[PDB]
């Protein structure tokens, strides 16, 4: 058999923000910042990557006219027959495309800063609210590997289309404010599954 390796290298074009998810890493950090960026315990930045690819592919495949399930609605059930069901998993099968986390190549002391954002009244133009957020700097390099177990002739094309939709929309949080605009580079290769023997 064969396996498909898509090594993606992500360069950050605008600021990036993915919020922390661990309770013990937020409540210990609310005395210092209000929106901590999502991190490893080795002080590296984590971004969820499979959900962005899945959301991208469901938007474009739903608007193209093909039947795809909508896993965006609450407590939705994947149909098990569509293209994103085969690629990213369903209920009864699993994802062929295992999508790694976006691990930063740098620590947080190099590519994470602590910004001060405001909220301004409209009548009087005064700083009504202040909050602080950890953002990822521009040009920070992230790396991930998409491993496709049973590859077809149209998995790499759909992954690249989802990546282009991500560069058009944004990854992570605060997407409508301009945060999270990225650039992707793909290195695709087709390995054998018995290659480690």
């Amino acid at each position: 058999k064969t396996m498909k390796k898509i090594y993606v290298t992500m360069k950050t074009l605008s600021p990036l923000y993915t919020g922390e998810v661990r309770r013990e890493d937020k409540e210990a950090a609310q005395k210092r910042v209000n929106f901590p960026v999502r991190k490893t315990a080795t002080n590296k930045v984590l971004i969820p990557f499979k959900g962005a690819l899945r959301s991208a592919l469901e938007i474009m495949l739903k608007a193209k006219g093909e039947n795809v399930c909508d896993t965006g609605e609450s407590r939705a059930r994947p149909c098990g027959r569509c293209v994103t069901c085969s690629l990213f998993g369903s209920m009864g099968r699993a994802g062929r495309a295992s999508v790694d986390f976006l691990i930063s190549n740098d620590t947080k002391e190099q590519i994470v800063r602590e910004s001060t954002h405001l909220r301004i009244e409209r009548q009087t133009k005064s700083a009504s609210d202040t909050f602080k957020g950890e953002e990822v700097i521009e040009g920070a390099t992230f790396t991930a590997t998409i491993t496709i177990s049973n590859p077809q002739e149209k998995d790499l094309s759909l992954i690249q289309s989802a990546l282009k939709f991500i560069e058009e929309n944004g990854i992570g949080g605060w997407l409508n404010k301009g945060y999270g605009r990225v650039s992707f580079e793909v290195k695709s290769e087709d390995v054998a599954t018995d290659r480690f023997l």
Binding site: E24, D25, A28, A29, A41, N43
Partner: peptide, 11 residues
């Protein structure tokens, strides 16, 4: 400083 921050999660 990472040790300072990781000391205050278990406190």
């Amino acid at each position: 400083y990472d040790d300072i921050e990781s000391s205050f999660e278990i406190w």
